């Protein structure tokens, strides 16, 4: 598709004159297949499915001031490693 | 539960009357009791005449079984009398045989029966009434308290000693006709059971026996139009009896009779009415009043003027507990029988009204 | 079966002296865990412990000094039935630490981490040989703000100060079905928590204390949760979301990424109240509250004064006597029924809201939808049968011999109570939920059975209505003549019969025309509107009734006097 | 006439009364509170008597 | 002329008068003021019997207190026991309306009678068992008003016809005559000498008759209304009527005068049956009103207030031996009081 | 789509299927939800929740067994495949599945 790589990019709506904000996002693929044997019996719990999820985050954050003496992190660097607010 | 045996007899005895006596009330609620009252030229006679050819379905089992018991105790009593005037008259006239005096004295020591007279007594009547001697004493004796009917139940003690006798509506009237003061009479209208008690021969204090019939449904006024004269008595009564204490609370049904009477003494022209009433002259036909095709307005101002001062009398007080149904009374006809049952319906509904908060 | 993974993963142990990027222990066939069997390793930023079926306990200090370990992710412990307290320890540049699938009894130990992270997330998961979360475990976790996110925690209870000396941003405690008991000082030292999400936790009641600065709340499928905080509790709320419709209007009421500082106005809570139950206490009107009572007061004095009247009566008992004490007993009901819903709604005045599940999901509810109906029920049916008893023998009065008796009557009695008790009960089997309105009505139209139900109801009291204007009809024909007629008395029971059929028809005329108009899913007036219905026409008949029956009736005033003088009263 | 007849019959009824006796009143009133003191005695509504001596119990 | 029998009377009627004053002192409460009053006496019901079906006109007690016999309007003669409340037997009559009662001494025969002028007379101990009518006493020109067995042979009836006559069962014929009197006669009573008897007329006139005698004795006019209940005093010197005005009086046969007068200024229904106690000391009378009242003939004074019947009281009567008072009220129950 | 960078579409992926009670492992053909979806993080901390993160998985699944050639007596010799039509990317239920840190996991039968 068309989605933009795991590669910093300006903020939409944080990046004030002069000092552009650098999100991290990106368009990691991500594989599942179905929960084979060794697996179903690596699970304490009933489990049909398995997934594996890979989502870009940021390696490393500064300190940033941002409008209205709100305190933001602008990121320095991306990259696809593992997801933390994946699961719900 | 337990009881003697005595205890158990007389328990079923009661239970045994209170059945029959239930059985009796299921009929005796089902009769209407209504009281007749006139003079003894208001006509009474003759409406109890228009009424007596649609009696109650001629007889009834019950009613036969007692007119049979009278009967039986009137031929008893006329043998024990024609027998005591044999033996106590001036000649001591015997039967004319020693078998015609033992028939006689069984029959008299056999008069103790519960209302059923043999065979053999009745033939034995009939053979000693066949004596020659015993109807010379009987006609010699005719002053005797033996009964007035004597002589017919004799006459007739062949059809009587005959098993499920059934003597005939005049004959069981004359068998009771005597100074009983009551005439009891029975009609069916509608299927209904109705009621009449013809009232008389005896003293004229209302004071005494009207106490009793407050229960009456209705008391029926009959009252003869004919005698101008005669009003002012009726008048006096109707107010009597409407302010009396017991019966200040049963309604009254008026009868006109003699109408037909009545038309042809106007028609003479003597108009004796206005001495008697001077108002009639003042009177006025009310603006309601139906005449029928032909008749003179002389009888039809009368008539209408009579029923407006019984409604007027009627009216002093207690309207609303008890009406009046005043009616032309006529005895050519027999539409009386229904003008009295709708009467009878439209006094019932009023009453049922009344404890029904609707009136 | 053979695997190519970097640690030598023999004699039962883990290899884990082993140079990798990014630890991984996937089909690694180790049970133990050697304790401080991680050191010498610097290169490792992340360690992932997943598809481990033959982990069963691990070491205490198993990760201590990783400095350079920044995220721990474990999951899959089939037989991790134990886990030695310390593990994590001396990780001040720790991220994320997450612990699912794992059957371990005993609470990990988290406050020895110490981590000096900007932003702490621990994630519990599938802790179902979890007993209970020990207390102050959180504390000392982290220096700055800690989010902790225990999703389907098996804990049974929380101990007293469990998060104490720490900043905490969010508590997610989503599917803690164990958890239906917390201790309200949880949250005693605990500046927050700013978001919360209890759903499908089935929690009795929330804390009374710690509420203020919750500016969140996820109680999705909380159908323990029948009762909410303080309104003004919930100072900083600005949205929630609420199992019970009933609960979100209580935030109806007051005391995306561009939005920033700005914030709404109103609260904001889902999903919104039901039309069939307004967001309203059981009377709607200030004049109500007194209305209501006062009629009440009138139906209950009348109903048990003709009771008291005609029970003791000692003269012989009357069909028109026993239809009378039947009539006065079914406005007893109904009198005793409104006192009831009277007093319901005094107790829970003011908070309507609060006690509006409790009390339309116990049995004082279904008990009160009961006698409505069947009250109602039995008074039509004995109103109906006095009008043909009354038609019957005024048209046949003359025939004494058709007339009713007690032991006839007694049948028919018997018949139609049971007929009334069948329709009134028909509701409760599951025919129509008496819980649909809060005024404890069958308002339950949408199933077919349901509504055919209800229109045939309708249809039968307006047959029974129109029979009886005929009967009435004919008998007043009847009674009427052409010749001999009384204009006084035909006027007076003109007057009765007109008076006796318009008490029943401005009583029963609306009411059954909303009930038609309801039957066809077109609701003419709102639940609010029908309310002043329901307490203005339906209580005519127990207020008119007993007044216009036996009050004006002279065996009745007689009974009274003959009672007075008994008494002393004379 | 009958009216005669009627005013003879009463005529001979007075006269016929007029010739009856009479007695001192306070013999009879002696007597007959003699009789009431000696039949006081057997007088069951006068005097209660107990339930089991009652034959209407 | 009918002047000088008309002043002959008068003269007549002033010195039998002037005569009664003269051997008149003082009325018999002063005498009995030397007594003290009886107290409150309490009734309670015992026995009631619903099985009766229509009105009760009239009552009568048995010799042995054990059986009364009671009749109705409607037609019905039934007679009860008080020992067990169960009837025994039930009486047709040809007759619906009945205003008279008697029991014989022996009980063998009941006899009964009203509103129509042919008198009946019935059995118990039928041999074929059912009751049936043993002869007729009828040619009375005027309505049956009271009866009583005076013996098992000869019985004394009223005639609505102001006639008084005596009838016997075996002759079936008016042995003595009464036709000597004046208006109309209620009741009879037979005091314990059957020698002589008291017959109340519906006029303020009480006579005494003679079996033998065939004339009439003394007249009373101490009554002020018409008179409808008579009763003797048990020792036979005195008895008391009722009026209907509410103003009994009480006459001494010796006195021959009226000697008190029981009645009270918020009593205004009449009185309609009256009874002495086994002594005389009570005496039970019976008001046009639902209620029954006692009155004390030696105090002259209330005893107390019954009010068990919800109807008029048609007839109350007292047993000989006074084990226990019956009244019969209009309505279709009877009540028993000891 | 596009032969780079696919989305979350099923594909003609191979899936051992095997029991505990069975030793043999039979692999047959079945659809696995893979590819990418967009994915994004939240700009600013500390002020708004933070957005969760939409992950490709199976939507509609449709059930598929193959019988079992002599596997151990004792156990049902049933096994039972999850086949999807269509797939879709979106959160992931925790009881739904064990989602979460990438494993790589051979798809064979070892």
Redesign the interface.
């Given at each position: 598709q068309d989605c933009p790589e795991c590669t910093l990019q300006e903020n939409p709506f944080f990046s004030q004159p002069g000092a552009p904000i650098l999100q991290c996002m990106g368009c990691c693929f991500s594989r599942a297949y179905p929960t084979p044997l060794r697996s179903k019996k690596t699970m304490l719990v009933q489990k049909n499915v398995t997934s594996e999820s890979t989502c870009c985050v940021a390696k490393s954050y500064n300190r940033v001031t941002v409008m209205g003496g709100f305190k933001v992190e602008n990121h320095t660097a991306c990259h696809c490693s593992t997801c933390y607010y994946h699961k719900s | 539960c337990t009881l003697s045996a005595e205890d158990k007899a007389a328990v079923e005895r009661s239970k045994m009357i209170e059945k029959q006596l239930q059985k009796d009330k299921q009929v005796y609620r089902a009769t209407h009791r209504l009281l007749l009252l006139g003079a003894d030229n208001s006509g009474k006679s003759t409406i109890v005449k228009q009424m007596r050819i649609y009696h109650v379905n001629g007889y009834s089992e019950e009613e036969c079984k007692q007119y049979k018991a009278v009967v039986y105790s009137n031929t008893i009593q006329s043998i024990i009398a024609i027998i005591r005037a044999m033996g106590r008259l001036k000649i001591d006239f015997g039967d004319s045989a020693r078998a015609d005096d033992a028939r006689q004295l069984f029959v008299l020591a056999g008069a103790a029966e519960e209302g059923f007279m043999t065979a053999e007594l009745a033939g034995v009547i009939k053979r000693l009434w066949k004596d020659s001697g015993v109807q010379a004493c009987f006609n010699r004796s005719r002053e005797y308290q033996l009964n007035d009917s004597a002589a017919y139940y004799l006459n007739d003690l062949d059809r009587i000693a005959q098993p499920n006798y059934i003597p005939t509506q005049q004959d069981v009237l004359r068998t009771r006709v005597k100074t009983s003061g009551i005439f009891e009479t029975k009609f069916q209208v509608d299927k209904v059971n109705f009621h009449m008690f013809d009232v008389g021969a005896q003293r004229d204090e209302r004071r005494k026996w009207i106490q009793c019939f407050n229960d009456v449904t209705a008391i029926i006024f009959v009252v003869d139009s004919s005698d101008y004269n005669r009003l002012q008595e009726a008048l006096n009564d109707f107010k009597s009896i409407w302010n009396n204490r017991w019966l200040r609370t049963i309604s009254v049904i008026l009868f006109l009779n003699k109408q037909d009477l009545l038309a042809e003494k106007v028609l003479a022209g003597k108009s004796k009415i206005e001495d008697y009433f001077p108002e009639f002259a003042r009177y006025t036909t009310p603006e309601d009043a139906t005449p029928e095709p032909g008749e003179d307005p002389r009888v039809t101002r009368a008539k209408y003027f009579i029923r407006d001062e019984f409604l007027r009398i009627s009216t002093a007080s207690g309207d609303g507990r008890h009406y009046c149904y005043p009616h032309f009374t006529c005895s050519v006809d027999t539409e009386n029988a229904r003008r009295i049952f709708n009467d009878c319906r439209d006094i019932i509904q009023r009453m049922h009204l009344r404890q029904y908060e609707l009136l | 079966?053979?695997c190519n993974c970097v640690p030598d993963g023999a004699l039962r142990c883990p290899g884990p002296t082993a140079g990798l990027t990014?630890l991984?222990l996937?089909?690694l066939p180790v049970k133990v865990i050697p304790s401080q069997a991680f050191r010498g390793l610097n290169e490792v930023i992340?360690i992932?412990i997943?598809?481990?079926?033959s982990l069963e306990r691990i070491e205490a200090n198993a990760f201590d000094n990783l400095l350079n370990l920044s995220?721990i992710?474990i999951?899959?412990?089939?037989?991790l039935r134990y886990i030695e307290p310390g593990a994590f320890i001396n990780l001040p540049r720790l991220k994320?630490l997450?612990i699912?699938?794992?059957?371990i009894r005993k609470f990990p130990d988290v406050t020895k981490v110490f981590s000096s992270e900007s932003?702490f997330?621990l994630?519990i998961?599938?802790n179902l040989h979890i007993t209970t979360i020990p207390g102050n475990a959180f504390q000392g976790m982290n220096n700055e703000?800690v989010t902790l996110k225990l999703?389907?925690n098996g804990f049974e209870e929380v101990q007293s100060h469990a998060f104490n000396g720490t900043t905490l941003?969010?508590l997610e405690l989503k599917?803690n079905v164990h958890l239906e008991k917390m201790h309200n000082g949880a949250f005693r030292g605990a500046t927050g928590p700013k978001?919360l999400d209890i759903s499908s936790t089935k929690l009795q009641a929330l804390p009374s204390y710690g509420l203020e600065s919750i500016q969140?709340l996820i109680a999705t499928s909380s159908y323990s949760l029948k009762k909410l905080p303080s309104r003004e509790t919930f100072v900083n709320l600005l949205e929630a979301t609420l199992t019970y419709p009933s609960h979100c209007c209580a935030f109806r009421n007051l005391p995306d990424?561009?939005?920033?500082?700005c914030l709404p106005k109103t609260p904001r809570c889902a999903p919104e109240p039901d039309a069939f139950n307004p967001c309203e206490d059981i009377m709607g009107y200030d004049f109500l509250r007194v209305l209501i009572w006062l009629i009440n007061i009138l139906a209950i004095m009348g109903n048990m004064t003709v009771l008291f009247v005609l029970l003791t009566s000692r003269?012989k008992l009357t069909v028109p006597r026993f239809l009378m004490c039947n009539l006065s007993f079914a406005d007893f009901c109904m009198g005793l029924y409104l006192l009831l819903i009277a007093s319901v709604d005094s107790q829970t005045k003011g908070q309507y809201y609060n006690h509006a599940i409790d009390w339309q999901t116990g049995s004082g509810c279904s008990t009160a939808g009961f006698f409505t109906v069947f009250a109602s029920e039995l008074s039509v049916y004995t109103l109906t049968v006095i009008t043909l008893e009354?038609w019957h023998?005024?048209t046949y009065?003359?025939?004494?011999?058709q007339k009713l008796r007690l032991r006839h009557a007694i049948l028919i009695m018997l018949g139609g109570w049971l007929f009334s008790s069948l329709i009134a009960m028909l509701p409760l089997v599951g025919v129509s939920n008496y819980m649909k309105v809060s005024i404890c009505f069958p308002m339950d139209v949408e199933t077919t059975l349901s509504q055919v139900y209800i229109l045939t109801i309708l249809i039968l009291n307006v047959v029974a209505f129109f029979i009886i204007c005929a009967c009435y009809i004919k008998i007043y024909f009847?009674?009427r003549?052409p010749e001999?007629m009384?204009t006084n008395?035909d006027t007076?029971?003109a007057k009765?019969?007109a008076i006796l059929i318009f008490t029943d028809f401005t009583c029963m005329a609306p009411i059954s025309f909303f009930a038609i108009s309801a039957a066809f899913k077109v609701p003419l007036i709102t639940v609010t509107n029908s309310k002043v219905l329901l307490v203005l026409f339906y209580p005519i008949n127990s207020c008119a009734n007993p007044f216009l029956?036996a009050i004006?009736?002279?065996?009745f005033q007689r009974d009274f006097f003959l009672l007075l003088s008994k008494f002393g009263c004379c | 006439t009958a009216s005669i007849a009627q005013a003879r019959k009463l005529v001979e009824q007075l006269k016929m009364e007029a010739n009856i006796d009479r007695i001192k009143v306070s013999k009879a009133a002696a007597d007959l509170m003699a009789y009431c003191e000696a039949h006081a005695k057997e007088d069951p509504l006068l005097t209660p008597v107990p339930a089991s001596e009652n034959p209407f119990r | 002329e009918l002047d000088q029998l008309r002043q002959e009377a008068e003269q007549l009627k002033n010195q039998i008068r002037d005569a009664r004053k003269a051997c008149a002192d003082a009325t018999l409460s002063q005498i009995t003021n030397n007594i003290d009053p009886v107290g409150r006496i309490q009734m309670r019901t015992r026995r009631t019997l619903r099985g009766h079906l229509a009105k009760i006109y009239a009552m009568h007690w048995g010799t042995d207190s054990r059986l009364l016999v009671s009749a109705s309007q409607d037609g019905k003669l039934i007679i009860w026991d008080s020992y067990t409340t169960n009837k025994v037997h039930a009486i047709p009559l040809r007759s619906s309306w009945v205003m008279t009662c008697a029991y014989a001494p022996s009980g063998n025969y009941v006899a009964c009678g009203g509103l129509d002028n042919i008198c009946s007379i019935y059995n118990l101990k039928t041999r074929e068992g059912n009751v049936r009518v043993s002869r007729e006493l009828a040619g009375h020109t005027g309505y049956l008003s009271c009866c009583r067995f005076l013996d098992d042979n000869q019985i004394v009836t009223s005639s609505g016809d102001t006639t008084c006559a005596l009838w016997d069962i075996e002759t079936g014929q008016q042995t003595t005559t009464f036709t000597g009197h004046t208006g109309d006669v209620m009741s009879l009573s037979l005091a314990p000498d059957t020698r002589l008897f008291v017959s109340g007329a519906c006029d303020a006139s009480a006579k005494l008759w003679d079996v033998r005698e065939g004339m009439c004795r003394q007249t009373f006019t101490g009554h002020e209304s018409d008179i409808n209940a008579i009763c003797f005093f048990p020792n036979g010197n005195a008895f008391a009527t009722g009026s209907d005005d509410a103003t009994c009086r009480l006459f001494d046969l010796r006195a021959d005068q009226e000697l008190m007068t029981y009645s009270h200024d918020n009593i205004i229904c009449g009185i309609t049956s009256v009874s002495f106690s086994k002594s005389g000391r009570l005496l039970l009378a019976g008001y046009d009103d639902f209620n029954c009242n006692v009155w004390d003939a030696l105090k002259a004074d209330r005893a107390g207030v019954l009010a068990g019947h919800d109807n008029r009281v048609s007839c109350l009567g007292v047993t000989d031996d006074g084990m226990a008072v019956a009244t019969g009220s209009w309505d279709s129950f009877l009540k028993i009081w000891n | 789509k596009e032969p780079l960078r696919p989305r979350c579409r099923p594909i003609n992926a191979t899936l051992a299927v095997e029991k505990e009670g069975c030793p043999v492992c039979i692999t047959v053909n079945t659809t696995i939800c893979a590819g990418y979806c967009p994915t994004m993080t939240r700009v600013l901390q500390g002020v708004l929740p933070a957005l969760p993160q939409v992950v490709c998985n199976y939507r509609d699944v449709r059930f598929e067994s193959i019988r079992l050639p002599g596997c151990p007596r004792g156990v049902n010799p049933v096994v039972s495949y999850a086949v999807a039509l269509s797939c879709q990317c979106a959160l992931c239920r925790r009881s739904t599945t064990d989602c979460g840190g990438p494993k790589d996991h051979p798809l064979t039968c070892d």
């Open positions: - | - | 079966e053979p990014r991984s996937a089909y992340k992932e997943s598809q481990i079926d995220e992710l999951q899959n412990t089939k037989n994320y997450s699912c699938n794992t059957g932003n997330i994630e998961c599938d703000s999703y389907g941003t969010s599917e978001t969140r990424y561009e939005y920033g500082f003269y009354r023998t005024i009065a003359i025939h004494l011999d009847a009674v003549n001999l009384a008395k007076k029971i009765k019969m029956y004006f009736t002279k065996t | - | - | -």
